[PDB]
Design a protein around this nucleic acid. Structure first.
Lengths: 285, 316, 80, 92, 94, 104, 94, 104, 80, 94
DNA sequence: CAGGATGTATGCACGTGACCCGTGCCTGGAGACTAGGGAGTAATCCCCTTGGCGGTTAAAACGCGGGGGACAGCGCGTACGTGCGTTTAAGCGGTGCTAGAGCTGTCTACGACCAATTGAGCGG
DNA sequence: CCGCTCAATTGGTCGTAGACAGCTCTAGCACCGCTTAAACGCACGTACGCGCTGTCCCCCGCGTTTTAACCGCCAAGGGGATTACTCCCTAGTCTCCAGGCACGGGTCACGTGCATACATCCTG
């Protein structure tokens, strides 16, 4: 019985050796080598030895804005796509090897430093922010760029696409088809101060998130609509029920007004039975 | 002092060699197709032998991170349909943009989602275009196969009572023959989506833990949350848990928490959480309450958060 | 309340030590003894209370003290 | 109703010391003693039956428990007493 | 006056002979409640429970003192030190 | 006829039998089991009472008190082993003093 | 042939969820089996007495929780009680 | 489906239930009791194995041996309280050396 | 069988004492240790044999040793 | 020559590090039979039973030695005496 | 710098020791269902603990004196530790035999359970 | 001592836990041959245990003063103990099938032996 066992071990050794030599035969370097390579070396060389282009065109033709890569340690631009010349009018040679902070607006640089900070691309590494970037051809010295991307590992960097969205809304919905309008979410203190605002608001309101937070919605509401909106505000504080406003004008960064309609409610935290904030969903008319 | 560890140095060295071999076996096996556990080393090498044969042949006869990034920035998805309108493939990103599962689109007619007044445009685009390729030039490179057109598409929904709602999208793509002729395009929403819902979890299962005060403020956040929610513990501590919840889900969660206040234990409804990366992620949470021994009254809430798929949310 | 451990007076400790056959006591003993007694009481009380809580009672009975001592390896006779 | 061994303890005391009475405090001690020994033997007998996959308790388990639990001199007497009691009981 | 140690031997005989509690009852009751309040407030206690605790506590401490006394004696000391108690406790399994 | 009487015992066989059936000690209890046990309980009881009665007599008392039970149990080495972990209410302690403490 | 139950399956699985890169010797496994039955008896025994002391005929999570609070050190008891609570909650809810 | 699966437990709730229903611990066993206990057993098991796995790696081992279980138990104050009187085959000891014995 | 107590050698005792952290041993210890061991071992055996006798067996099992140790507060793991 | 006590330290460290039985197995097995014959002659033993006894015995003695060592140290001594063993056994109530 | 001689380390093959997968498979877990006893609950009572009021008093707190005990320092010698050679009996690896452990099947005497009777035990 | 049960005991019926007879193989018991690490006995050196002297300061004994403890009384009412009804929870029953377990075959980790080349070193 012991003899059978021992020869089974021989069979195992023989089978392994047979496969190691066979594995070696598939590696050009191992096959070219005259000498009988050791088992460790064969395996090392074997692991070294171990459509997408169609998709590349499919996605690139649909591409918009520009890709850029910026280092987290210094804000240095490591790469940018040629399409950036359409948007910022700077060339690849003007941006690469220079700090992104040299092109960002001073108020947005602080936000980018925070965005670049760490916390198949995973959502945890995901970053998305609006910022103002300098243009080679000029307030018009800057344009508002939406930057969305993920943090990537020697120098850590953000890989993101910068997109220059139109402040105008192209192709209005047809009356025949029920089409979802543009929307943004914001939340307000009891006195109407922004305590939260999203990027959709910035695309719609032109104001970047830091330009809205800590200010009253009444600073942007048109006085013709404030009387109505103020009534909705006074009422919404009294109820959990959603109150929908009429269409109203809201001031945007470029100094113009746009027409919005919004649904408001006062959210109560059941643990304290207290209103945390006014919650608003705004809709573009 | 007395000489020692001579035997240990030799035994360690012999063992070190065995460890090096074991590392290479693991590495070699890891790259294989048809990966399985409990394979013997002989099987690992045999599959590695066959893999190298297949790898050399397939590469001789022949972008992910970029493609994901560009699709998200564009607020778009790949969509491929037959001339007959039947959908053959769609990128998962469509679920975040139009709330459609791949299972809702694939094998279905595209005209089920296009408004009836726009059917003729897409039927014309599919039916008018015909091309036979030569043996030298790939179809995608031919300007004849490249096409750009726009149409509306119906959105999916969790609650079917919601009135039919559509999105205007642009198709940028090319015609390709399959072993019939399909059209494949990146579909971009004309209306930008600066915030979207994560509908599929990148891992089969993931979880994170937190503790909350009797005001529902964060008392604790574990090391597992930040990879999921993007926030480090100090970024959430002292803030209300509600600050991260979706506008519609705030009310349903309040009801769930009221139930928890009543029984001290339970499970939440499905809800969305706003990540630092500005994505809404669908979650479901298990809760229990811990009590102050002196009087057996509540002191804090312990929360176990499970990330869930859009399909799981809509299923119940 | 508080500070009732000091209610275990030096003489009270002397008497106990004498029953134990102790002829002479250092001053450091008295504080040490109080510490030990406090722990002992905490152990018995914690268990006696635990029994009381399980029974959903608010009054601690001698039987709970007995059950606490029994599980601790100490058996006391004459209290039911 | 509550039960005690005070009747039986008293009767036993009069067998050994007819001239002697018992205090209520001492009676409390004796009742605790009887119940403690009962628990010790019943517990040990239960474990013995368990270890031998027996569902029934017999005099063998008790005798064994007695030999295990009691000191040598007490065990010898207690066993002879149990043996006599069962023998007499069976005969009567 | 008597020379020290003579009185102690008289006290030892007295207390070993005695059965009554050597510790004051009311201070003990307050101490029990002081501790018990930490596990649960608004507790009530049977007087029998208090006596059960006092009897158990004295028996415990005296037993500890007996072992403590042996330890000091083993060290060829008359006076007991905290270290004698700590050793006895450690050996006893505390 | 009473089972205790058949066994020639003072202790109640019926109560012991019931107590063995209670407490979940077993699924079944042998008829001779409570008889054997009652004899043991009675025997041990008698040993303590007999020694305690002597202790009472030594103290010139005609009634047993916990002090007597304590001395009897602690003086008898077999009972001391059996009940060495037991505390007796108002038992006191044995009058043991180490020789090293005595004057010389 | 006969069959004997063991916890070896479950002890193994638990380790694989904690330290997937490690295994268990046959002796260590025998020890873990000895441990599980010991603790089981301690809890089941304590729970039995708690039912007896309250004249109850049924063992519930309350008896076990109490037995856990009595048997375990406070740190382990807190975790063990929470885990038992969660397991029952999840089970009863499904 | 197994009750253990329904409770998210690894331990055999069905086995635990049989073991609680047997052994005469009570006349009846609550349906939730086995689940609660299985969770406790699993928790304690995990705590020991977690420490043992560290002990193995701290000594460059990939295999848990009785020594690791002993070391884990004696180093962990709570486990040593629970298992302080327990002896382990080939358990070994903590490397306790008194300062008075050490060179200085 | 006689004098097998001598089978516990002085070196064996030294080594056990070393495992216990003992640095220095008086000569009287070796016989004292043998005496104490004899008693400890005897106590365990008497119980293990008693279990064996109750089981109506002629061979002592490890389980009997375990039970003997268990009831003596010497719980042992590794032998079931 | 190694100075007195340097060997003992190496031995302590070595024996504490190891897990092997220190008592010679055959002599032990005979000792078990030598005692067991007093309770029942013509008695047989499982080999595992003998090892179980030995492991319990060595563990017991080691525990006793550690306490004994503390007693000698408490006395400000290094050498352990039978007196130190007897004290430890008395304190543990053996 | 060369060649022959000696040792370290690399590399492999070797079988044993430890280990796991597969196949069989059956036992025991889970599911469905019911019966009726256990537990939960409401409604009541009234015994015991909580709490205070007041006085008497031993017991506890505090202070001082001075002898006794704890302790450090010093010296003595010897019982112990350390090293060595010699020996032996413990380990190890066998062989050889069967008493006893352990499981299988039969059957009984046994205790659980219930209806009936009675007189030892409990309240006052 | 007096009154009144219903706990204790009788005498059945019933199902089965255990005793019993029997067989099957396991592990232990008994013995030998060989290897050599552990065990024994002896020689030599001194660190450690022990005894002793001599400070010096800590605690004990005693007295006196002051404080809260005991003891006794009281009332308030809350909580534990009790009895009465509902119903729902799990033991008990029957069934089905797959998960966990044992046995066989095969595989991996280990040291250990060995071949082999390279490190190196002695002298020309």
């Amino acid at each position: 019985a012991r003899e059978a066992h021992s020869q089974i071990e021989k069979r195992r050794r023989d089978k392994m050796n047979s496969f190691i030599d066979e594995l070696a035969s598939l590696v050009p370097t191992c096959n070219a080598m005259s000498r009988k390579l050791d088992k460790l070396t064969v395996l090392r060389m074997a692991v070294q030895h171990m459509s997408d282009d169609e998709l590349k065109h499919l996605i690139l033709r649909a591409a918009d804005g520009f890709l850029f890569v910026v280092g987290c340690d210094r804000g240095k631009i490591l790469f940018v796509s040629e399409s950036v010349f359409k948007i910022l009018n700077y060339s690849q040679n003007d941006l690469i090897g220079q700090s992104l902070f040299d092109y960002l607006h001073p108020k947005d640089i602080a936000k980018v430093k925070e965005q670049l900070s760490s916390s198949r691309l995973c959502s945890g590494a995901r970053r998305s922010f609006f910022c103002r970037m300098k243009c080679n051809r000029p307030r018009k010295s800057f344009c508002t760029i939406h930057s969305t991307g993920y943090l990537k590992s020697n120098l850590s960097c953000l890989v993101a696409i910068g997109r220059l969205h139109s402040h105008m809304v192209p192709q209005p919905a047809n009356g025949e088809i029920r089409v979802k309008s543009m929307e943004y979410v914001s939340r307000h203190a009891i006195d109407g101060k922004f305590v939260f605002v999203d990027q959709r608001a910035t695309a719609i309101l032109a104001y970047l998130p830091q330009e809205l937070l800590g200010t009253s919605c009444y600073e942007y509401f048109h006085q013709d609509d404030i009387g109505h909106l103020a009534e909705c505000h006074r009422q919404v504080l009294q109820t959990r029920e959603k109150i929908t406003t009429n269409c109203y004008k809201f001031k945007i960064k470029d100094g113009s007004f746009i027409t919005l309609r919004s649904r408001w409610f006062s959210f109560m935290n059941p643990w304290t039975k207290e209103v945390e904030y006014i919650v608003s969903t705004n809709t573009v008319v | 002092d007395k000489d020692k560890a001579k035997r240990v140095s030799r035994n360690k060295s012999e063992k070190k060699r065995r460890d090096q071999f074991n590392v290479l076996i693991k590495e070699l096996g890891s790259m294989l197709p048809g990966n399985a556990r409990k394979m013997d080393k002989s099987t690992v090498l045999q599959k590695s032998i066959d893999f190298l044969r297949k790898h050399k042949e397939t590469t001789a006869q022949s972008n992910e991170e970029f493609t994901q990034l560009m699709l998200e920035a564009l607020d778009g998805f790949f969509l491929a349909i037959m001339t007959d309108g039947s959908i053959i493939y769609v990128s998962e990103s469509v679920t975040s943009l139009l709330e459609h599962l791949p299972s809702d689109l694939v094998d279905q007619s595209i005209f089920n989602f296009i408004p009836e007044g726009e059917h003729s445009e897409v039927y014309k685009i599919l039916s008018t275009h015909l091309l036979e390729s030569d043996s030298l030039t790939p179809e995608y490179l031919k300007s004849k196969n490249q096409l750009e057109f726009c149409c509306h598409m119906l959105r999916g929904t969790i609650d079917p009572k919601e009135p039919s709602t559509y999105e205007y999208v642009r198709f940028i793509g090319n015609f390709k023959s399959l072993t019939r002729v399909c059209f494949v395009a990146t579909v971009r929403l004309a209306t930008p989506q600066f915030i979207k819902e994560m509908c599929t979890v990148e891992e089969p299962n993931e979880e994170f833990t937190s503790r909350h005060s009797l005001e529902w403020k964060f008392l604790f956040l574990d090391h597992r949350a930040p990879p999921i929610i993007g926030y480090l513990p100090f970024e959430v501590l002292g803030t209300s848990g509600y600050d991260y919840y979706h506008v519609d889900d705030l009310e349903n969660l309040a009801k769930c928490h009221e139930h928890l206040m009543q029984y001290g234990k339970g499970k939440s409804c499905y809800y969305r959480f706003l990540t630092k990366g500005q994505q809404w992620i669908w979650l479901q949470t298990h809760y229990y309450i811990t009590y102050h021994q002196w009087n057996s009254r509540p002191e804090f809430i312990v929360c176990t958060h499970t990330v869930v798929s859009y399909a799981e949310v809509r299923a119940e | 309340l508080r500070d009732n451990i000091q209610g275990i007076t030096k003489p009270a400790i002397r008497r106990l030590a004498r029953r134990g056959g102790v002829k002479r006591i250092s001053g450091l003993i008295y504080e040490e003894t109080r510490g030990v007694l406090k722990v002992f009481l905490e152990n018995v009380i914690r268990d006696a209370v635990t029994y009381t809580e399980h029974a959903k009672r608010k009054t601690v009975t001698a039987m709970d003290v007995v059950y606490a001592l029994k599980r601790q390896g100490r058996t006391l006779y004459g209290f039911g | 109703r509550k039960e005690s061994y005070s009747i039986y303890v008293y009767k036993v005391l009069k067998q050994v010391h007819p001239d002697t009475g018992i205090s209520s405090k001492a009676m409390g001690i004796m009742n605790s003693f009887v119940n403690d020994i009962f628990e010790r033997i019943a517990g040990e007998a239960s474990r013995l039956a368990h270890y031998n996959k027996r569902s029934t308790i017999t005099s063998r388990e008790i005798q064994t428990a007695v030999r295990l639990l009691l000191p040598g001199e007490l065990a010898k007497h207690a066993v002879s007493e149990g043996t006599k009691a069962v023998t007499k009981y069976t005969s009567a | 006056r008597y020379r020290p140690g003579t009185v102690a031997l008289r006290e030892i005989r007295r207390y070993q002979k005695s059965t009554e509690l050597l510790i004051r009852k009311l201070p003990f009751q307050r101490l029990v409640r002081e501790i018990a309040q930490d596990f649960k407030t608004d507790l009530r206690f049977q007087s029998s429970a208090v006596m059960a605790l006092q009897e158990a506590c004295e028996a415990y401490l005296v037993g500890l003192f007996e072992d403590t006394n042996l330890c000091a004696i083993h060290a060829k000391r008359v006076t007991i030190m905290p270290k004698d108690i700590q050793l006895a406790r450690r050996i006893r399994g505390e | 006829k009473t089972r205790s009487s058949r066994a020639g015992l003072q202790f109640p066989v019926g109560r012991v039998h019931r107590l063995l059936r209670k407490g979940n000690y077993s699924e079944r209890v042998g008829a001779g089991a409570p008889v054997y046990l009652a004899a043991v309980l009675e025997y041990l009881t008698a040993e303590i009472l007999e020694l305690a009665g002597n202790a009472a007599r030594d103290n010139k008392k005609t009634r047993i008190i916990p002090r007597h039970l304590q001395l009897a149990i602690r003086n008898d080495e077999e009972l001391n082993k059996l009940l060495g972990r037991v505390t007796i209410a108002q038992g006191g302690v044995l009058p043991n003093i180490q020789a090293v403490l005595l004057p010389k």
